[PDB]
Ligand binder design. Structure first.
Ligand SMILES: OC[C@H]1O[C@@](CO)(O[C@H]2O[C@H](CO)[C@@H](O)[C@H](O)[C@H]2O)[C@@H](O)[C@@H]1O
Lengths: 140, 144
């Protein structure tokens, strides 16, 4: 399961947030985009796949994933197309929304907070640690 | 060669600005095309980067975008030690790869990400070696 991601959209302050969750780790990446378009989705996926070993993305079946540009991006990147941390992200965005002028800044603060937050006590791991451990282990 | 050290540079192509972050120990890169080297764009890039990797230190070219208060405030928030002026065949490398995929993309920003993808997946050191992508996670992993 190291190459499995789930992608979802969130709408906030009349803007769109694209969120990718690495399913096995809970690690997230996110971008704020003007609108939920095929071009933006394709670009997002291309960035994701240049950064992590992406094999499969699970999506809602919106039209932004059907587009020919998204299909070309996925073909090129070797990606196959097919809420727990999602309500959380919204939560953290609120907790810090005041520390920032723009929405996209608060979003990236929340991603930061989420990915570095240790789960559990001493002995625990953050999501950022889990994803790299999983991938490093897979590579052996 | 600490695992937490990144170098940021900029490169210009077709009248556009590419901000590049290089994980020094592994050669792994991240990049974005931005409208101009401003404080807020730079600060936004750094905050995203720090959200995705354990960034302890960033070496910069001391450009005016880094001396801006917006960037210094981002580094402070993210706990990044900003090291300005601390010392490049990487930019030559990225530009070369960008050339090899440029006719597959309608827009430069797309060709840049494709180039980043190719660089990070390229096996270095022969069939027996590893890519920058493999190297960064092997270096950064705390519990294998
Ligand atoms: O290069 C523009 C491209 O980047 C995206 C994210 O994929 O926009 C975000 O990232 C840029 C680079 O950091 C920022 O300049 C921009 O403001 C931010 O929204 C895409 O939306 C866009 O196509």
């Amino acid at each position: 399961s190291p190459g499995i991601w789930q992608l979802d959209c969130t709408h906030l302050e009349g803007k769109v947030i694209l969120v990718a969750v690495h399913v096995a780790s809970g690690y997230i990446e996110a971008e704020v985009i003007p609108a939920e378009t095929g071009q933006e989705t394709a670009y997002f996926l291309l960035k994701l796949a240049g950064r992590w070993p992406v094999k499969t993305v699970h999506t809602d079946n919106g039209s932004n994933f059907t587009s020919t540009t998204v299909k070309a991006a996925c073909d090129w990147a070797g990606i196959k197309q097919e809420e727990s941390m999602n309500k959380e992200l919204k939560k953290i965005i609120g907790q810090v929304r005041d520390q920032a002028e723009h929405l996209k800044t608060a979003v990236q603060m929340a991603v930061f907070i989420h990915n570095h937050k240790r789960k559990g006590g001493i002995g625990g791991y953050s999501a950022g640690e889990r994803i790299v451990d999983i991938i490093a282990t897979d590579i052996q």
